[PDB]
Amino acid sequence: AAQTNAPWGLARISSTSPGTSTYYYDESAGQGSCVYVIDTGIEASHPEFEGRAQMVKTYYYSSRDGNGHGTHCAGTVGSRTYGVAKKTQLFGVKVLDDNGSGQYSTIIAGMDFVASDKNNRNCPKGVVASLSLGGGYSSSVNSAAARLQSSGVMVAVAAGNNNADARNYSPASEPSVCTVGASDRYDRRSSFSNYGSVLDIFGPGTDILSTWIGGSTRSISGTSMATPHVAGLAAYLMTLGKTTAASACRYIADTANKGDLSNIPFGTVNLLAYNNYQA
């Protein structure tokens, strides 16, 4: 299948050279898979989701997305125009308040929630969790992301927007989960993207057009935008039988465009998420 004039990030993950404008993907499009977007929520009513998104948990007075951030990320996972896996099922776990803040204890709760709640859902192609969130090093938070991973879910996390080593950030620094740096449309490392040996993969991250609350759309930047690309990819590849939840991050790194990024510091991988689809 081909999506003409797709957002640059979508086009990038389907391409070997930057600058292209079409996103190429198998039509299964993550059908049968499930991506938990753990964030400020998802505007499940947005026509971009087609009734494939639904909120399943909140730790706040409302489960609505009063921010747009979480909606932006779920749009990059599974929205019809903006997502990688366009037939996937999107579950909203709202661990962030409408300012994008959340307490670690709540984040952990949300992760533990997902490990169990996937057993309430029909996801015969497997389960992905997307964590466009983080802060200072916490081993409790890392352990939580590890458990979620070990529990049979593919965990993609943002590397962080500090332009520092992701070593000092969580869940970004948890080895067993897929930790995602951000690049721009020119295959540069995004100016803000964290780096270091704990990164596993880069994804499109600067000027990412995607769904927004109020049924709108907008372009924002961050490793929070790269994460859902790899989350969507994971789910897309699991539907295709090509990998499993436990193997996906390694698969994506095996099959990624290698060496194509600039301003990658020594010690940080130079791998750009890539679906390797051949029509």
Curated annotation (Swiss-Prot):
Keyword Oxidoreductase carried by entry: no
Enzyme class: hydrolase
Swiss-Prot/TrEMBL cofactor(s): Ca(2+)
UniProt GO molecular function: metal ion binding; serine-type endopeptidase activity
Origin: domain of life: Eukaryota
Amino-acid positions noted as binding Ca(2+) 2 in the UniProt annotation, renumbered to this chain: T16, D260
Active site feature: D39, H69, S224
Cellular component GO terms held in the UniProt record: extracellular region
UniProt cofactor note: Binds 2 calcium ions per subunit.
Residues the record lists as binding Ca(2+) 1: P175, V177, D200
TM stretches of this protein: none
UniProt similarity note: Belongs to the peptidase S8 family.
Role description: Hydrolyzes keratin at aromatic and hydrophobic residues.
Protein name in UniProt: Proteinase K
Gene field: PROK
Portion of the full sequence shown: 106 to 384 of 384
